[PDB]
Amino acid sequence: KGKPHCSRNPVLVRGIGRYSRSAMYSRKAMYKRKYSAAKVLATVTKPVGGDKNGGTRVVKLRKMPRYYPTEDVPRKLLSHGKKPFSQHVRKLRASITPGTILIILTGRHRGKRVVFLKQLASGLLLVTGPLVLNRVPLRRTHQKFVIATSTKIDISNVKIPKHLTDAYFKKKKLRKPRHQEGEIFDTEKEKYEITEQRKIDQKAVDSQILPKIKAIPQLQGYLRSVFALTNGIYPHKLVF
Amino acid sequence: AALRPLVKPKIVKKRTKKFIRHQSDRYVKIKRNWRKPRGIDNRVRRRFKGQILMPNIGYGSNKKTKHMLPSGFRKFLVHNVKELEVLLMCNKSYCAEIAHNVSSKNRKAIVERAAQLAIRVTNPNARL
Amino acid sequence: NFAELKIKRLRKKFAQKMLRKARRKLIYEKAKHYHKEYRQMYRTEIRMARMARKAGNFYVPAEPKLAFVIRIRGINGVSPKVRKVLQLLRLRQIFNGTFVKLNKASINMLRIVEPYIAWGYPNLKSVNELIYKRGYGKINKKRIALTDNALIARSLGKYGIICMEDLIHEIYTVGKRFKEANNFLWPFKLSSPRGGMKKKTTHFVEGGDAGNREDQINRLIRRMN
Amino acid sequence: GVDIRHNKDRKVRRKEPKSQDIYLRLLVKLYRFLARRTNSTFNQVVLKRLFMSRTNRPPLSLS
Amino acid sequence: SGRLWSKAIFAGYKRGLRNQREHTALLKIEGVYARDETEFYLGKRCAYVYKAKNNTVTPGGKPNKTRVIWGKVTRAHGNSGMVRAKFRSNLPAKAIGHRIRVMLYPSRI
Amino acid sequence: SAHLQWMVVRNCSSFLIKRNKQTYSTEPNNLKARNSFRYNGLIHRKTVGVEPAADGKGVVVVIKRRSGQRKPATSYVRTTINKNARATLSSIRHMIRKNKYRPDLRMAAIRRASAILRSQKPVMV
Amino acid sequence: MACARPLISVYSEKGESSGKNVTLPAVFKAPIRPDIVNFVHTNLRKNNRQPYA
RNA sequence: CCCGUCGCCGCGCUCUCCCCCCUC
RNA sequence: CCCCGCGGACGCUACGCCGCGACGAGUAGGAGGGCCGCUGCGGUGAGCCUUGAAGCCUAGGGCGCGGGCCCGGGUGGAGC
Numbered sequence A: 001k002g003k004p005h006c007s008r009n010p011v012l013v014r015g016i017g018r019y020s021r022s023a024m025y026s027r028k029a030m031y032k033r034k035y036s037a038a039k040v041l042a043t044v045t046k047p048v049g050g051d052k053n054g055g056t057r058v059v060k061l062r063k064m065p066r067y068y069p070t071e072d073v074p075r076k077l078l079s080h081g082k083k084p085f086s087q088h089v090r091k092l093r094a095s096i097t098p099g100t101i102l103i104i105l106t107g108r109h110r111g112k113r114v115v116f117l118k119q120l121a122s123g124l125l126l127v128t129g130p131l132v133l134n135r136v137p138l139r140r141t142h143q144k145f146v147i148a149t150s151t152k153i154d155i156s157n158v159k160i161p162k163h164l165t166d167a168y169f170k171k172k173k174l175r176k177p178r179h180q181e182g183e184i185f186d187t188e189k190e191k192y193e194i195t196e197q198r199k200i201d202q203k204a205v206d207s208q209i210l211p212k213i214k215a216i217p218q219l220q221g222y223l224r225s226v227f228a229l230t231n232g233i234y235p236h237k238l239v240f
Numbered sequence B: 001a002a003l004r005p006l007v008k009p010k011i012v013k014k015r016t017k018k019f020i021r022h023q024s025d026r027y028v029k030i031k032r033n034w035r036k037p038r039g040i041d042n043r044v045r046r047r048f049k050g051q052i053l054m055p056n057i058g059y060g061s062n063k064k065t066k067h068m069l070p071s072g073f074r075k076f077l078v079h080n081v082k083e084l085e086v087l088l089m090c091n092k093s094y095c096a097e098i099a100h101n102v103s104s105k106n107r108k109a110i111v112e113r114a115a116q117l118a119i120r121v122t123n124p125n126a127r128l
Numbered sequence C: 001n002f003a004e005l006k007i008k009r010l011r012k013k014f015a016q017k018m019l020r021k022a023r024r025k026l027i028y029e030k031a032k033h034y035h036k037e038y039r040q041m042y043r044t045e046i047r048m049a050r051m052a053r054k055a056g057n058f059y060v061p062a063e064p065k066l067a068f069v070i071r072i073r074g075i076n077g078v079s080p081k082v083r084k085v086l087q088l089l090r091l092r093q094i095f096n097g098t099f100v101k102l103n104k105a106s107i108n109m110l111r112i113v114e115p116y117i118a119w120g121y122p123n124l125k126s127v128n129e130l131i132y133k134r135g136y137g138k139i140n141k142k143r144i145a146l147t148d149n150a151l152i153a154r155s156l157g158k159y160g161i162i163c164m165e166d167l168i169h170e171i172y173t174v175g176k177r178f179k180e181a182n183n184f185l186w187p188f189k190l191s192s193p194r195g196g197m198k199k200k201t202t203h204f205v206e207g208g209d210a211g212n213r214e215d216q217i218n219r220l221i222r223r224m225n
Numbered sequence D: 001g002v003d004i005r006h007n008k009d010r011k012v013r014r015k016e017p018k019s020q021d022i023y024l025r026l027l028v029k030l031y032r033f034l035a036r037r038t039n040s041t042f043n044q045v046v047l048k049r050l051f052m053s054r055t056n057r058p059p060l061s062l063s
Numbered sequence E: 001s002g003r004l005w006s007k008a009i010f011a012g013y014k015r016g017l018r019n020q021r022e023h024t025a026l027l028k029i030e031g032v033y034a035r036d037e038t039e040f041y042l043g044k045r046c047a048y049v050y051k052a053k054n055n056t057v058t059p060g061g062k063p064n065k066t067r068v069i070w071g072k073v074t075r076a077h078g079n080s081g082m083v084r085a086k087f088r089s090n091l092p093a094k095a096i097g098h099r100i101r102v103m104l105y106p107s108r109i
Numbered sequence F: 001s002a003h004l005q006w007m008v009v010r011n012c013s014s015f016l017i018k019r020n021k022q023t024y025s026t027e028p029n030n031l032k033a034r035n036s037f038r039y040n041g042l043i044h045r046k047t048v049g050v051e052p053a054a055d056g057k058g059v060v061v062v063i064k065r066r067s068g069q070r071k072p073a074t075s076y077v078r079t080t081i082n083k084n085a086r087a088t089l090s091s092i093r094h095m096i097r098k099n100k101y102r103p104d105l106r107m108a109a110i111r112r113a114s115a116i117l118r119s120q121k122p123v124m125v
Numbered sequence G: 001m002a003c004a005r006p007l008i009s010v011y012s013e014k015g016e017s018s019g020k021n022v023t024l025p026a027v028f029k030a031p032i033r034p035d036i037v038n039f040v041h042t043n044l045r046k047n048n049r050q051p052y053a
Numbered sequence H: 001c002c003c004g005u006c007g008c009c010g011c012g013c014u015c016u017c018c019c020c021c022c023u024c
Numbered sequence I: 001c002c003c004c005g006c007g008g009a010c011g012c013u014a015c016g017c018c019g020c021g022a023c024g025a026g027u028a029g030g031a032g033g034g035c036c037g038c039u040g041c042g043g044u045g046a047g048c049c050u051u052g053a054a055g056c057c058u059a060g061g062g063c064g065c066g067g068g069c070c071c072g073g074g075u076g077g078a079g080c
Ligand SMILES: [K+]
Pocket: B056
């Protein structure tokens, strides 16, 4: 086995390489790389044990079903596309770059102005409105429900902790194990608790973003106010 | 809880309202049962706008979901336990229902047997 | 014999694979040759007229031999002679286009149905986009979309036409087998012209949409498919 | 709207015997398969004659 | 702490003079009086918020009398800033001349 | 002959049920209980039927022997299988496939045996 | 099949075979033909009818 | 034999060996 | 020369099932289909029914393009 090489056919447009068939034949040296010519044990034997009980038993793994439904569903045709969500490409608007001030449009933080840190692996944006400034923690948000303003701060050379991933921010639940019939309420735990790890991470990011916010004048006051529509102005006439 | 059908496609109904007979609203003697208007000057037959619509084959339901109950099953009328076992191998596509004339004592046995054979009954609690 | 039959099946599959591979290479090179031919005629007309002007003379181009005819009126109240000619042009529906080879016999037919059609001289791009986007073949009396080259080759291979490029070449440069290639094409079912029509009831030269518009049929085609 | 006539769309021809003779229906099944699964035009002619009415199947004298 | 939605008016259904297509509605957005300014609002979620008699469940809140029929702006209508909207259910005719909110949610800016 | 007898009873039979746009057949040895030439339990030289046991446990696999086709008293051989579900299905599979006794009814008989056994196990609360 | 005529046992009044056999009469190999049977039955049931007016 | 990631079409790498630039 | 697996969905009321393409105005009139409907007769449903038939009523649940039909509740009292 040889070491895998790079593509050697740079893509100039999606689906088209820069070099032709003959050009790639020579780049690959296909003239000298010409070739002419040259499992899973379903059953396992095991010592059963016992006098005159036979030597062993040919035990087959994955036994046959012991019940069949009255009818089944035919299998699907093949689709040659339709990748799972974890393999989708993640697209981010050109107006959203790290350090950009965003405006939240939905949720309990409606209309607040927050700072954009990174896009996460699922395409969700990681935002912090410095929790001291507007009570928005390190939180995920969707780029389709934010407004990217033109005001930006340089958050380069700041360290967003590595464990701040989608699995970190994914919600957790209790109900309803060991309990089927609902007569005693399982409404306990509903008070979601801020993990001490979350407080540590919030303190770490803010300690190095807040100083850069304080650098230029009255940005903390800007982050501290909320966005609203006044009867004079209209969103299509506004420059963000 | 209830027995589920093999597949539950989305049932699309082209029309959800009945085709009422022309002028059945103006007369008691004329019932809502559809009758094709054949008068020489009838504006419903001529299909003038804003009039009572006429049934035609274009309103036909999809053959995949025709005669399908809202529960995704199709119904087979049964009169005794013996007719119930024809649905043993059609459990997940066809549901039984008991005829109106069946006695209270006898439909108890039908419901009991259908629970055993995993056949769904549309009227399991019907005389009690 | 299991090994012998397995080898026999591999030999046949390889031979079939080499046959497509040779057929694909032929299709590739013929399209390359057509591209060379297409610019040769385009440059020749420029050069021909360019040298007449040097001499102070006039180069009169050959009269176009290909026309795209679009029916622009409906099927209500049509006189029998106009009705018959539209059927002979395979224009039984409004906004049905078809390719017509131009000669004395066909032109006089186009003059009969003058108020009912808009026609002109399609260029190379119009032929390509009509065939590729809306090209349907009449295969066993069925309207079949030209999704594979095998559909063209099965019905027209005896005439040398085996791919979409060959079909486009025969239609554009009216070849020997134009009648077979043109009739193989189902009449084109075009959408309503996006952006409207100036006036369907009068001739093009009087502000309307009917009659012969020489090269302006290409503007109509873009808005129409 | 399209400009065609619909009075000749439905071709009038026997697609099966109007008889209920179960023995005739059995050998119609046999020759329906033979006509489909062979290239013999003889089977096609025999199959369509099996659909035909009695007046279209006149008796053949020995002479 | 703010309006956060644009004020719009349900002017009527898409229609000819003598035929009315109730599945789509024509909305007049405040401040948008030309067709070239409707680009911002295309695809934006629109809501017809009203009140009824019986309480209904409120997402993230106690049940109240507020109901809503959701929709979105589909395209521009005419040359003067009207937009066409599709709602999950055809808008009731009692809402003509009343408030429709345009959410700004699916932001492209 | 099966094909000739089918042409007689395809639409005229005492076992025929035609209701609710559906058709069913109630002859003793009809797997799936449908009106069809393949599944008819009377017209074929060899047939297989699966029925619940006389008591409330096990299945009865009845096959049709080849000798006395005009002698209905001794024309069917009935065997009773009263073991676990997986072993019961294997026996029915071997009876049909290994004997090459109507292999086109293999899954129908296996599915019917599963339905019978599934109906015999007690219901839950 | 059609030319083959089996032997049928004659059963005794006690219900078991008596040892006597009769070859199957050829009438039992005649064509089975319900459309004729239905036709003949349809027109012969009309023959015992009693007039009404 | 755990659910055909399959056909046509367009490509990439390996069964050749060297280097170059980042990264462990 | 299948065998560490002895195994491998559905189907084909052939009057059935499946695929592809085009098409769909209609008086007078013609034809086809009707698991539309009424009454009675021959068969058949080891059919239903005083533990409630027919009929009738119903802001009850549904099915069918439709003719119509099934089921729940009430009334009724001997058949269907
Ligand atoms: K009609």
